[PDB]
Amino acid sequence: KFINTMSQVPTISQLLPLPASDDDDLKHKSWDYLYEPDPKALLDTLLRRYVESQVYQ
Amino acid sequence: NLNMDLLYMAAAVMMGLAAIGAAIGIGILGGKFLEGAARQPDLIPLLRTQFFIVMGLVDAIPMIAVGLGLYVMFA
Amino acid sequence: NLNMDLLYMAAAVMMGLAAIGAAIGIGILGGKFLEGAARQPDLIPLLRTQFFIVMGLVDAIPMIAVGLGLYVMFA
Amino acid sequence: NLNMDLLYMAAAVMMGLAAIGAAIGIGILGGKFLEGAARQPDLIPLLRTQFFIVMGLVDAIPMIAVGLGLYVMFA
Amino acid sequence: TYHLDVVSAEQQMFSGLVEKIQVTGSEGELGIYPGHAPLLTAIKPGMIRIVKQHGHEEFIYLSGGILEVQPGNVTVLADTAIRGQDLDEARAMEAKRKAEE
CATH class of the missing domain: 1.10.287.80 (ATP synthase, gamma subunit, helix hairpin domain)
Structure with a gap:
């Protein structure tokens, strides 16, 4: 991870299954696909x- | 004589078919209104205005046949 | 005397057309309401107040034809 | 006798059939409009004016069936 | 007029406010007028037609991707190269071949 111009860190992050990123809304009612x-x-x-x-x- | 019933039944047929035209015409217009609401509730206060204009025409012919059916009952 | 029987008959056909007109019309309209509820169950009380704005109009012309059907039954 | 009694039967049944056509038809065409309005409400004026053009042709054939229906009622 | 963004993973192809566009969707042609309905679909490879606000009509080739719409904000998530399950399966086999070596 390029945290800074001066500093970086090795990481392991899970891409599947999809992380439960909260991403909470109700505005989907107002435009639904x-x-x-x-x-x-x-x-x-x-x-x-x-x-x-x-x-x- | 029997001719008095057959002129009455003439009102009955005029009423019968005109009632199906107006009921289903309004029902199909109304069914797609609910599909617009099903996607997008903020549209429904607009959509009630345009629905009532279009529904107004759907009545315009059947309401003529309704009134003549009332007159032919009395006359 | 045939005058009586054919008045009975004229109500019965006029009644059947009004029964079909209403039952089909609100069945169609109610089907789109249940699609909206299954799609969008948060809004079902809002859609319920929409569905009943529309339902009364579908009934209005078939109920007139029932009113004449019952008068030709009564007289 | 029978010519004038059946005159009642004809004009009434013609308008009953024409009231089906002129109300089922623009109900169907009403539902697609009210959907198209719920699709693209910047074009409710454009759709409504476009919808009037289409509706006028739908009515044209049924209006003549009421026209003959009153002409048999007058004469 | 509406704010349109055409983007890809590497670079953002185009953006700005727009009067309308014509786009080849998965099922057929679609025109985005002002304030169009919410939409989601895949879009086919080809030119798409832009008319930017003040009427500046333009062509953008896209190798495909996804279209989304909602009345105030619209975006296209364009792919860079032609995507096919068969072609990607061929790349998957190609990838294994290297592993053996």
């Missing part, structure tokens, strides 16, 4: 892209 084609396939692609994103970071 049209799932095309279907919700579950979209969610799998998001999870796969998200893992690739964390590895690249």
Whole structure:
């Protein structure tokens, strides 16, 4: 981890299963998505892209 | 004579079909209104306004057949 | 004398059309309400007050045809 | 006798059928509009004016069935 | 007008306020007018058409990705290279081959 220009630390962090990051809201009622084609396939692609994103970071 | 009942039944058929047109027309209009609400409750106070205009037309023809059915009962 | 019987008949067809019109119309409207509840169970009391704004209009024209159906039963 | 009694039967049944058409049809077209408004409310004015054009064609055929229905009622 | 961001994992391709766009979704074409409905879908590889606010129409090629919409803020999460389960399975086999060596 590049904590600072002057200092860095080795880390081990779990990317799967998804960490329970709290991410708490109620504003989802106010704009809720049209799932095309279907919700579950979209969610799998998001999870796969998200893992690739964390590895690249 | 029997012709007095057949002119009454003429009101009965005018009423019968016109009631199905207005009931299901309003019901399909209303069913999609609930799909708009199901996604997005903040829209529903807007959506009640536009619903009532569109529902107004759905009545416009059946209400003519309703009134003539009332008149043909009395006359 | 046929005058009496055919008045009985004219109510019975007019009544059946009004029964079908109401029962189907609020069945459709109620189905979209239950989809909204299964999708969005936090809002079901809000949707309940929407569903009953709409339900009364679906009933309104079929109930008129029931009113004439019962008058042609009574007279 | 029978020509004038059946005159009642025709104009009433024609309007009953036309009241089905002119209210089922724009109810269906009403539900897609009220959905499209819930989709894109910047275009409720644009959809409403677009929706009026489509509705006028729907009504055109049923209006003539009321027109003949009153002309048989007058004559 | 709405705030659009087109981004990828490596770099942010484009951003700003926009009058409308046309996009090839997984199921078909979609136009985002001002204040469009909430949406989630995958988008196909190709050009997408931007018209930035004050009418500056433009083409952006995307290799794919995800579209999301909500009325005030919209974003596209673009992929860099053509993504296919078969192609990625081929890369997975390629990755194993190196391990043996």
